[PDB]
Design a protein around this ligand. Sequence first.
Ligand SMILES: Cc1cc2nc3c(=O)[nH]c(=O)nc-3n(C[C@H](O)[C@H](O)[C@H](O)COP(=O)(O)OP(=O)(O)OC[C@H]3O[C@@H](n4cnc5c(N)ncnc54)[C@H](O)[C@@H]3O)c2cc1C
Ligand SMILES: Cc1cc2nc3c(=O)[nH]c(=O)nc-3n(C[C@H](O)[C@H](O)[C@H](O)COP(=O)(O)OP(=O)(O)OC[C@H]3O[C@@H](n4cnc5c(N)ncnc54)[C@H](O)[C@@H]3O)c2cc1C
Ligand SMILES: [Cl-]
Ligand SMILES: [Cl-]
Ligand SMILES: [Cl-]
Ligand SMILES: [Cl-]
Ligand SMILES: [Cl-]
Lengths: 237, 237
Amino acid sequence: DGRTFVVREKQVESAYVTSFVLVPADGGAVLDYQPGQYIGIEVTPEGSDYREIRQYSLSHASNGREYRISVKREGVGSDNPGLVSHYLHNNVKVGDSVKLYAPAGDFFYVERERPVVLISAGVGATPMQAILHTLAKQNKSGVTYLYACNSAKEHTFAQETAQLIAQQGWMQQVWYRDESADDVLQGEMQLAELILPIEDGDFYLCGPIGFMQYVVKQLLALGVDKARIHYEVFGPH
Amino acid sequence: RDGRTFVVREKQVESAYVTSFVLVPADGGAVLDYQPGQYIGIEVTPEGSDYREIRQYSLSHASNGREYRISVKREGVGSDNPGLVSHYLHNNVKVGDSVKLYAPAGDFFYVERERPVVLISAGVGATPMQAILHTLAKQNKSGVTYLYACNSAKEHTFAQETAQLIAQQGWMQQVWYRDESADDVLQGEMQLAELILPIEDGDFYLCGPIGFMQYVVKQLLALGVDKARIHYEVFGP
Ligand SMILES: Cc1cc2nc3c(=O)[nH]c(=O)nc-3n(C[C@H](O)[C@H](O)[C@H](O)COP(=O)(O)OP(=O)(O)OC[C@H]3O[C@@H](n4cnc5c(N)ncnc54)[C@H](O)[C@@H]3O)c2cc1C
Ligand SMILES: Cc1cc2nc3c(=O)[nH]c(=O)nc-3n(C[C@H](O)[C@H](O)[C@H](O)COP(=O)(O)OP(=O)(O)OC[C@H]3O[C@@H](n4cnc5c(N)ncnc54)[C@H](O)[C@@H]3O)c2cc1C
Ligand SMILES: [Cl-]
Ligand SMILES: [Cl-]
Ligand SMILES: [Cl-]
Ligand SMILES: [Cl-]
Ligand SMILES: [Cl-]
């Protein structure tokens, strides 16, 4: 069964986000993909009669050996705690297996030899992470990384991203909505007071719709043509 | 005073409530040696930011002079008083973040006596036992039995890592789940009477909450184990 993958690592990325490194158990194989794309993960949650399938963006660069995805605990401390995300967080240990369906998706980086801007918030960072590592392996110049999250504790991939930015000589800017920090802006992401490649860059977007629709209308306005704005949605939320 | 600044290199989920932290000195250079079974101290200042808090955490890997791993149970989940330091570490201390760490100490640790070795623990009691397993693996020790009790599959700390060691070293293990059955585990309380064990010659090392400790020590004595061959450390609650 080529779908059977085992969890080799389970890393906490932030307060609500945990990563899973997955490898074939039963003779499957790690297929190539473009950064931005997703795989389907199938598990059978506790109590539940049924198998359940959810999509998760690859969060690292394609290497043919292992996949990484990064899962937000959805609906935490709420009326309806997300079914698959909680099961993954609470029950799927290193050494446990899941069934996995091959990479696919309409959203992915395309090399156009132009500047690149990655913008995300919250768990929308996941496909941006795959793109960052890919660009890093390609020694792409002209990369800007713009990221928003509620606070330091929800700052997903903070260290990993910072090392990459410094190593490749890129630039980044982070906003914490709910508190202040050094080199961090406080509040919602504000894109007027900083240097962006508006005329020629490609702008890649991923986050809650509210966060995005805001910034999608914002770039249309700033002169960027819609053909240069690319975005992913984790469903209609 | 505080001891010394370390940085979280890795944050791995071990089970539903236990998360490991791999810590390296912010200095660089060697960290103090220790005996498997000993603990370090962690000190932080929780989001209720008045005072610092210090807690003992057991080393859960073999000593190697370069980094420390500890494994921390989220205490008091679902209670009126979720444990301050454990929740702070789980929720706020990310990879790349730093903590203050005190040097290894403690009177409970493995001593080579060329006897068969029994390791017995429950829940997070497994943490120092993990340092001991790794040390004995390194030393090619033969005649090791690992006995472990936890509530269920989702709380089965180090399940994969321990299975691998055992499969690599030719050792023996038995696992008990208090609240459910599973393939090749016993359901219920750890009962020793019917196990093949080196009662006359073995060293018995025990770690876990006091109630479990009292329960196991009474069984050991009734079976005929000399008190001088029972070594133990209590932490709970
Ligand atoms: C292309 C794609 C990529 C994705 N990538 C990622 C990723 O990288 N990381 C990641 O963590 N998640 C990602 N998701 C979201 C993921 O697929 C799941 O929908 C999510 O994990 C929730 O599933 P669940 O079973 O936990 O919650 P469910 O039990 O299915 O539903 C949770 C509850 O909240 C509402 N809800 C349902 N889905 C969502 C949602 N996605 N967001 C907010 N509220 C919701 C529902 O009405 C439901 O009542 C992606 C989704 C898509 C389509
Ligand atoms: C030698 C040794 C080794 C140890 N090794 C480990 C290890 O490897 N891993 C590990 O996870 N832990 C270990 N511990 C235990 C650990 O040091 C902590 O005691 C534990 O993490 C709890 O700390 P906390 O700050 O999270 O909880 P605390 O906040 O100290 O709470 C302690 C208990 O008191 C209750 N409580 C707190 N406040 C109140 C209040 N206002 N009213 C009523 N009740 C309250 C809490 O619910 C909790 O049950 C070890 C302890 C010792 C002595
Ligand atoms: Cl989010
Ligand atoms: Cl919110
Ligand atoms: Cl820090
Ligand atoms: Cl001695
Ligand atoms: Cl138990």
